[PDB]
């Protein structure tokens, strides 16, 4: 059977129409068909499968069958194995999908697409057995194993395989498909991390010490020395020195560390403006440093907006806004900029000067917190950020327990001790603020123990109490109960809850750390991708680069590259050969397994037993 | 026989040797400043620091102890988690301290007190030092305070704290206390627990490897402890001017005997490995399967011959 001649487009649609009618794919196709009929030979048309693929991927299967709108029904498919694998995958048939993937031209991209589609359908699965099978598709495992084989083979063609534009999947980079699939374990592979590190250091050698890099950064002229080694490959000399300067200062790591240094400068300047150079309203004029800070933040917001929106040529504005607001750190950025605007506006007035100063004080905290997200890319710090983000849940559980116990104890003690205090502020104080401070060693017995209560001048009258003429006298009717309750509260809170939280953090750390490392690598990929297009000038300078970019756009990538046809075909054949070798190795290891050998031995011993029994009967006949 | 520059590099490579160099440099500087009168107090201060440096040297001295050395290695490994916690705490503390200093004392020009209220006090908040008398208006004392900057700078009266939005200051103090004194500290405890569990086994081996070198050093060390050691040094110098249990050289016959014994033991070890490989379950399964295939084909031929008769 010749699949290339067997699989025509009409035959493919015939296969798609003959779905089992009891699986998820049939329900999705029916939904699409009803939608198309409402918007208005074969039960399902290629429009329905195209829309299903649009739901599942939304960028890859564009023009797979719409290009010609349907193609010639008798014309054979250009990519038969790709279509067969896609078809077998949409209906949770994994054994067949596996066989088709073993025959496809591009296997890593196919495996990543398969795992993406499986994890997308896992949510839509109705039956628990189907969902369980879908969650164990292990198609990402196939991609990782095949890429491990490829990386062990060449380690130089593997990077080209990662960064090339696949022909079968609409010029989609393998890394792009992995990002779409959110294949975290694939990015955790050593080869992908090595490629990302190579991108990270730019022209410099990846083994360069951090101290040498920092020293060279702080003293620019040392770039032309031999302090840092570079990877190989009047007018000429000037070109050489300019090339060296650019190759050093265009490296993503240098851009990152410059951004960090200038963000530290921003925090220093913000603190100085807020603490020493905060002047009266514009009638007396905001300080020049305050204007510099305003310009600084304007440049920062410009960079944020450019990175979030102007990086992509074609995408819906509403979709881009939703994607931006999806991230929590972007919500923190929005809070920071809103606080900055409100504080500046209130500062410009005189009746709201103090409110503006307060809002700017809060904004400094927000920016200093933004610093953590800035440092997220650090090799030693990022996993810690992930771990803390996971610890937040145990923090919330402890908060629930502590809140219940604290409400109880505080309200009871406020009732027992100050039953005649009408002041709501002081009621809430003695009910919640003081018991909360009891946790941190702040136990003011002068207001709780009669033997320790001072002979201060106190009143019992409510009127005088409200006016604040004298502090309200504490009730000492049953103070033994108050002291006993304080003892029990101290025990419970300061021992049981705190040590329980310590145990919870220990367990959570042990269970989470390994996943946190993989998640850090997966996030590191995206951070390096972002640093690719980021201008090499850190803020507030970044305005020069923004103006230059705007002027160039008005007048007029190491990752995700496109290769010549000959080299592309060579790499495709090399991938196919490596896939064949990997499958042969798996099959050979299966044959030599102890269980397979036992099965073979048992079957052959049974056959030998019956045959030699016949032979012995023949011998006894003689 | 070794290059002087190479020996200097090898010496300065070790961190404890760097600590020793710091100690001796501090001793020299302190003695020099003590010899003068205008720098007497500075010399006393430098010697005070040097005492701390020597008392820290005591740990490296005790490193060879059988029960203490692995603990030294473990602490040296814990330093990294200490640094991670330091980064987190530094970021959070800078944020909270600068914000509270802005909210509470917006008119204090004194840089020393700005840095105090911004970093020293929030740092002490970790260790149960929470002076609410300067943070909560209901707890702020009726002390004699000034608002004027001039008088503030001269130190005539302490600067009055701002109480515009003190609910925000108390809320920020509550959040800072929660985060720092609970999340960061218990996270560091968990990090130390995990690091201890993962590191202890390697720390023991590293302790043994270092113990070898320490014993090698103690081999040639004179038996007289300092300050007496000068007698041994003078004796050694005089002997050098006038004129080992480990790393010994053996006679030719004994050397050849030990070489042949080593070869025999190596042959025995290799034979044991090969024998254990032959008797392994996997090798037995492979042998059985191959012999069963051969027996199958051969007995099939034999049965064909028998059926021919
Ligand atoms: C292992 C475990 C640990 C936890 C716990 O169980 C065991 O420990 C138990 C110990 C127990 C506590 C043991 C003892 C007591 C005392 C008792 O009062 C005795 C009754 C009398 C009658 O009102 C009160 O006395 C007097 O009050 C007056 C207040 O008007 C004071 O006037 C003051 O006025 C001025 C103050 O400004 C100044 O002039 C002086 O300062 C002073 O003159 C007197 O000086 C003082 O004599 C109440 C109960 C209490 C606190 C126990 C509570 C429970 C424990 C903590 C147990 C734990 C479970
Ligand atoms: C479970 C969890 C724990 C954490 C938390 O959430 C829940 O707890 C919440 C509790 C809450 C707090 C609850 C209550 C309050 C009070 C409120 O002020 C009310 C407004 C008024 C208006 O300015 C202020 O009042 C007055 O100020 C004056 C200062 O000029 C005082 O004058 C003093 O002058 C002299 C002082 O030397 C002396 O004569 C006397 O000492 C006294 O006369 C008055 O006495 C006092 O009446 C501000 C907010 C605050 C602190 C809450 C903050 C947030 C919490 C901690 C929550 C946590 C998240
Ligand atoms: C963590 C929660 C947040 C929300 C809340 O409880 C803790 O905060 C508390 C702070 C309280 C304030 C504190 C001070 C004053 C001033 C006083 O003249 C009148 C009453 C009022 C407004 C109080 C009303 C009730 C409030 C909001 C409490 C509220 C349930
Ligand atoms: C852990 C870091 C070390 C470095 C540093 O921050 C913490 O130490 C702080 C101590 C500060 C000092 C403390 C006291 C005074 C006296 C005062 O009349 C003039 C200002 C000056 C010199 C301050 C300048 C800024 C200094 C060095 C801060 C500096 C960023
Ligand atoms: C309390 O107030 C009264 C008012 O007359 C006064 O006589 C008395 O001395 C005061 N005591 C204290 C401790 O202030
Ligand atoms: C504060 O200083 C003034 C100066 O006249 C003085 O009259 C007043 O008694 C002082 N108050 C305190 C509490 O020292």
Residues of A in contact with B164 (CB under 8 A): 354, 358
Given a contact cutoff of 8 angstroms between Cβ atoms, the answer to whether A483 and A448 are in contact is yes
Contact by Cβ (8 Å): B300, A611: yes
* Rounded Cα gap, residues A252 and A145, in angstroms: 30
A339: tokens are: 């606080």
> Which-ligand-closest: CA of B144?
6
Please list, in sequence order, all residues whose beta carbon lies within 8 angstroms of the beta carbon of residue B300, skipping any fewer than 6 positions away: A611
Residue B217, both tokens:
């050093």
Identify whether the C-beta of residue A83 lies closer than 8 Å to the C-beta of residue A73: no
Residue where the block lists tokens 């050397």: B255
Q: What are phi and psi of A130, to 5 degrees?
A: -65, -40
CA geometry: angle at B233 spanning B229 and B237, to 5°? 170
| Residue bearing tokens 């020009």 | B109
Task: Please count the other Cβ atoms lying within 10 Å of the Cβ belonging to residue A522.
Answer: 19
How far apart (Å, rounded) are the C-alpha atoms in residues A37 and A475? 78
For residue A521, CA distances in Å to A149, A183, A402, A474 come to 21, 11, 36, 59
Question: CA nearest A147: which of A617, A525, A595, A575?
Answer: A575
Give CA–CA dist A296/A222, Å, rounded: 29
DSSP H/E element including A130: helix A128-135
- Compute chain B's Rg from CA coordinates: 36
Burial of B43 (C-beta count, 10 Å sphere; 0-12/13-18/19+): middle
The resolution in Å comes to 2.8
A509 contact residues in B (CB cutoff 8 A):
187, 190-191, 193-194
Q: Residues A58, A117: contact at Cβ < 8 Å?
A: no
Closest CA to B23 of B62, B4, B61, B49: B49
Count of C-beta atoms within a 10 Å radius of residue B291: 11
**3-state DSSP assignment of residue A92:** coil
Q: DSSP letters of chain B?
A: ---HHHHHHHHHHSHHHHHHHHHHHHHHHHHHHHHSSTTHHHHHHHHHHHHHHHHHHHHHHHTT-TTTHHHHHHHHHHHHHHHHHHHHHHHHHHHHHHHHHHHH-TT---HHHHHIIIIIHHHHGGGT---GGGT-GGG------B--HHHHHHTSSPBPPP-TTHHHHHHHHHHHHHIIIIIIHHHHHHHHHHHHHHHHHHHHHHHHHHHHHHHHHHHHS-SSPTTTHHHHHHHHHHHHHH---SS----HHHHHHHHHHHHHHHHHHHHHHHHHHHTSHHHHHHHHHHHHHHHHHHHHHHHHHHHH-
The verdict on a CB contact (< 8 Å) between B168 and A362 is yes
Other Cβ atoms within 10 Å of A41 Cβ, number: 5
Residue A165's H or E segment, with its range, is strand A165-166
Residue B95 and residue A369 in contact, taking contact as beta carbons nearer than 8 Å: yes
Q: CA of B150: how far to CAs of A274, B110, B159, in Å?
A: 20, 11, 10
Backbone angles phi, psi at B267, to 5 degrees: -60, -40
Rounded to an integer, what distance in angstroms lies between the CA atom of residue A576 and that of residue A598?
33
B299 vs A502: CB contact, 8 Å cut-off? no
The token duo for A435 is: 């018991």
Nearest to A614 among B91, B182, B303 (CB): B303
Is A333 annotated in a binding site? The answer is yes
Q: How many angstroms separate the Cα of A354 from the Cα of each of A278, A280, A345, A446, B160?
A: 11, 10, 12, 35, 16
Instruction: Decide: A308 and A324 in contact? Cβ < 8 Å.
Output: yes
Handedness of CA B191, B197, B198, B201 (dihedral sign): positive
Ligand 4 neighbourhood includes B142 CB (under 6 angstroms): no
Q: How many angstroms separate the Cα of B253 from the Cα of each of B63, B250, B258, B260?
A: 41, 8, 9, 11
CA of B116 to the centre of ligand 4 (A): 9
Ligand nearest to the CA of A456: 5
CA atoms within 13 A on the CB side of A482: 23
Q: B55 with B14: CB under 8 angstroms?
A: no
Q: Chain B residue with minimal CA distance to A372?
A: B91
Question: Angle formed by the axes of helices B69-104 and A252-275, to 10°?
Answer: 50
Neighbours of A533 (CB within 10 A): 11
Q: Please, what is the angle between helix A382-417 and helix A479-491, to 10°?
A: 170
**A428 within ligand 3 shell (Cβ under 6 A):** yes
SS3 of A57, please? coil
Distance CA B187, CA A404 (A): 23
- B126 - beta bridge partners? none
Q: Is A156 annotated as a binding residue?
A: no
- A-chain CB neighbours of B288 within 8 Å are 597, 601
Cα–Cα distances (Å) from A378 to A186, A251, A520, A528, in that order, read: 20, 15, 10, 11
Specify the length of chain A in residues. 622
Distance from CA of B84 to the nearest CA of A (A): 7
Torsion from C-alpha of B251, B254, B258, B264, nearest 10 degrees: 140
Q: Is the CA virtual torsion B229, B231, B235, B240 positive or negative?
A: positive
Exposed e or buried b per residue across B119-146, where buried means at least 16 C-beta atoms within 10 angstroms of its C-beta: bebbeebbeeebebeebbeeebeeeeee
């Amino acid at each position: 059977v010749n699949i290339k001649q067997f699989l025509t487009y009409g035959r493919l649609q015939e296969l798609y129409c003959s779905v089992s009618e009891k699986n998820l794919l049939h329900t999705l196709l029916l939904k699409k068909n009803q939608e198309r009929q409402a918007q208005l030979k074969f039960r399902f048309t290629f429009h329905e499968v195209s829309k299903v693929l649009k739901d599942f991927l939304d960028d890859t299967c564009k023009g797979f069958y719409q290009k010609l709108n349907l193609p010639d029904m008798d014309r054979r498919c250009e990519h038969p194995w790709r279509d067969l694998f896609l078809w077998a995958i949409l209906q949770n048939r994994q054994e067949m999908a596996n066989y088709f993937w073993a025959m496809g031209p591009e296997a890593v991209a196919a495996a990543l697409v398969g795992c993406k589609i499986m994890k997308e359908m896992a949510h839509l699965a109705t039956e628990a057995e189907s969902a369980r099978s879908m969650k164990n598709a292990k198609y990402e495992q196939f991609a990782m194993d095949l890429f491990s084989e490829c990386y062990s083979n060449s380690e130089d063609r593997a990077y080209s395989l990662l960064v090339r534009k696949t022909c079968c999947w609409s010029k989609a980079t393998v890394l792009n498909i992995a990002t779409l699939a959110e294949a975290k374990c694939f990015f955790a592979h050593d080869g992908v991390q090595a490629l990302l590190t190579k991108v990270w250091w730019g022209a410099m050698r990846t083994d360069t010490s951090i101290s040498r890099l920092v020293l060279t950064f702080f003293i620019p002229p040392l770039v032309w020395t031999s302090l840092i080694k570079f990877n190989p490959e009047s007018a000429t000399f000037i070109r050489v020195v300019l090339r060296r300067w650019n190759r050093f200062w265009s490296a993503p790591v240098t851009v990152f560390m410059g951004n960090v240094i200038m963000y530290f400068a921003f925090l220093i300047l913000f603190s100085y403006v807020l603490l020493l150079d905060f002047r009266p309203p514009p009638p007396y004029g905001p300080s020049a440093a305050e204007i510099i800070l305003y310009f600084w933040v304007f440049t920062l917001v410009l960079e944020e907006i450019r990175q979030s929106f102007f990086t992509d040529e074609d995408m819906s504005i509403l979709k881009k806004m939703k994607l931006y607001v999806e991230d929590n750190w972007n919500k923190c950025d929005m809070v920071a900029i809103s606080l900055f605007v409100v504080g500046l506006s209130c500062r410009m007035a005189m009746s709201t000067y103090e409110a503006g100063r307060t809002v700017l004080a809060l904004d400094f905290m927000v920016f200093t917190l933004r610093l953590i997200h800035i440092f997220a890319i650090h090799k030693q710090l990022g996993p810690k950020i992930i771990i803390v983000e996971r610890m937040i849940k145990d923090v919330f559980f402890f908060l629930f327990f502590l809140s219940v116990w604290l409400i109880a104890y505080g309200v009871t003690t406020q009732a027992l001790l100050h039953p005649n205090d009408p002041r709501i502020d002081w009621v809430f104080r003695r009910a919640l603020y003081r018991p909360y401070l009891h946790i941190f060693g702040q136990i003011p017995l002068e207001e709780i123990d009669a033997a320790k209560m001072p002979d201060d001048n106190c009143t019992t009258d409510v009127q005088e109490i409200i006016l604040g003429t004298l502090p309200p006298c504490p009730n000492i009717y049953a103070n033994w109960l108050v002291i006993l309750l304080l003892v029990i509260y101290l025990l419970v809170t300061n021992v049981l809850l705190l040590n329980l939280l310590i145990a919870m953090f220990s367990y959570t750390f042990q269970v989470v750390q390994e996943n946190a490392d993989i998640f850090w690598k997966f996030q590191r990929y995206n951070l390096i991708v972002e640093y690719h297009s980021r201008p090499a000038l850190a803020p507030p300078f970044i305005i020069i680069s923004h103006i230059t970019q705007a002027l160039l756009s008005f007048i007029k990538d190491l990752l995700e590259r496109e290769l010549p046809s000959g080299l592309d075909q060579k790499l495709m054949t090399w991938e196919t050969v490596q896939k064949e070798n990997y499958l042969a190795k798996l099959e050979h290891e299966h044959r030599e397994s102890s269980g397979e050998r036992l099965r073979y031995t048992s079957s052959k011993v049974q056959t030998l037993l019956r045959m030699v029994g016949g032979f012995k009967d023949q011998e006894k006949r003689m």
